């Protein structure tokens, strides 16, 4: 609520450079030897940024280009062409704002960018919201949002100040309620056998969707409460503040198309509901809180 | 030492499992971490139980059943051996399982009659128990060879089933590196608390050897390690123990699956000499392990001789 009179957020631009990928089903298998060394043995690898996420379509990866070196080319695997930056959004202080707050960032932020012709990707995880562009959009990321952001650039791990350079789609509701957890990494290794069958080893009102994402050191879990009951029920959060899934569009989203998380976060923010969003290769999903399920669908319905 | 009756006879049990007997090239093994962590570390999700993996210079040699075989793709990386391998154990008169580290004890008994009759073998000596392969067309000289000592049984649907007539060259260089080896075991439920190291050992990267075994067979889990290799785990891996174990390679050039006695010339001498020891074949290499402290004397008897 209140703030001082002449005081701005924060937008940060972070160091990462992110390659966006899909592997078919059948071939996840491959990819086994390399995830496993991201996920569970970062003294490995020079990836800071590490993203999976299973669909029924396919598993979503973002990675950074560390990362990305780890991977073999294969038939399974479609990389997106354009290499993705990520922003974060902060208060003045540098501090962090609460997660789940997309909808909080539909004007400022999300609204004006695809005004703008700037095609992003969401990733909330259980810390924040990560809002990806493509590299060849950042001056114009810039022009967009300095009015209300001061935006810094990380440049050697530090934040610093820019200058001038430095339709509608269908929607369905299945019945999982999700959960939004966290692990404090030195557990990851007593909870790794079960995440290794559940991610690597498996065969309309109901979908699959499971979130993985380990980004500097911070791990990020979304599951359905079902799939919770196979682990120790040692994973984190405060609460059981449970969520309902929002799947968006029809076919195949491109990379191209701006306004899709326009469409859905700007209703939900008229409408005071929160949310977290995440852009897979193919489709996007919002997760808004249980209770509230009806009422987003509601408030969807009225766009044209 | 121990009593018996006169008239009572060991058992020799031909176990239900069918054999592949394979060699992994260590660059292709990222290739085959997806079937190798499912067999190690879900067994509940295939129908494989017989598993061992062994880690050594040249390669990574796996002997697997045929349902585990299964799940392993073809590749340039991947050799497989041509013969299905049967699997012998002995057991005592009254079906009971005799002591581990036992080759020596069967040397006699088994292991030189098998290589007086041609019959090539591949050992397998686990912390549980010293398993015997041969390939599937030696099953009635086995039989022919054994039977007069053992009462011998073909395990069908998990029950032993009495066997009625006939049922369903060179001396070789030894070294002994550097290394110390434990003889290790491991409750199955507490894996998981060692997945993401053990993992780390086998996938992800002379006077010393690189070495390491691992297998499950029915259930049971086996592994031999370097004395080094055994810091960068929780130490609740069981023994009874500080005896460590000298590793003798033996052979000079990869040793094929023909050629017969290999075992019996290692395992002979070392009878005599009442020095117990494991024996695991790997795809090219034969490996003895024995007593640290009887080193010296094992390599003396070695070099008095004229799978
Ligand atoms: N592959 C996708 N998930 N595409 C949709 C992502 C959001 C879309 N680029 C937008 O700016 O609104
Ligand atoms: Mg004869």
Redesign the interface.
């Given at each position: 609520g209140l703030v001082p009179r002449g005081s701005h957020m924060e937008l940060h631009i972070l160091e990462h450079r992110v390659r966006v990928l899909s592997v078919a089903r059948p071939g996840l298998?491959?990819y086994?030897?390399?995830l496993?060394?991201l996920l569970?043995?970062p003294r490995?690898s020079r990836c800071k940024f590490f993203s999976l996420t299973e669909t029924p379509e396919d598993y979503t990866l973002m990675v950074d280009e560390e990362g990305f070196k780890e991977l073999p080319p294969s038939e399974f695997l479609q990389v997106a062409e354009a290499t993705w930056l990520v922003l974060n959004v902060s208060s003045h202080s540098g501090a962090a704002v609460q997660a789940a707050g997309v909808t909080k960032i539909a004007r400022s932020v999300i609204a004006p960018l695809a005004e703008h012709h700037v095609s992003v990707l969401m990733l909330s995880t259980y810390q924040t919201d990560f809002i990806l562009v493509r590299e060849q959009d950042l001056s114009v990321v810039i022009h967009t949002l300095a009015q209300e952001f001061d935006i810094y650039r990380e440049v050697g791990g530090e934040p610093v100040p820019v200058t001038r350079d430095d339709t509608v789609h269908p929607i369905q509701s299945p019945q999982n309620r999700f959960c939004v957890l966290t692990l404090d990494p030195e557990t990851?290794?007593?909870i790794?056998?079960?995440l290794?069958?559940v991610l690597?080893?498996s065969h309309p009102s109901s979908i699959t969707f499971f979130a993985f994402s380990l980004i500097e050191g911070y791990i990020s879990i979304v599951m359905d409460a079902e799939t919770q009951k196979k682990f120790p029920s040692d994973l984190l959060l405060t609460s059981g503040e449970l969520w309902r899934m929002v799947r968006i569009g029809g076919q195949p989203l491109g990379f191209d198309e701006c306004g899709i998380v326009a469409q859905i976060a700007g209703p939900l923010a008229a409408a005071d509901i929160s949310a977290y969003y995440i852009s897979t290769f193919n489709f996007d999903h919002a997760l808004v809180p249980e209770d509230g399920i009806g009422s987003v669908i509601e408030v969807l319905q009225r766009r044209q």
């Open positions: 298998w491959l086994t030897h390399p496993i060394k569970f043995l490995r990851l290794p007593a790794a056998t079960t290794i069958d690597f080893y």
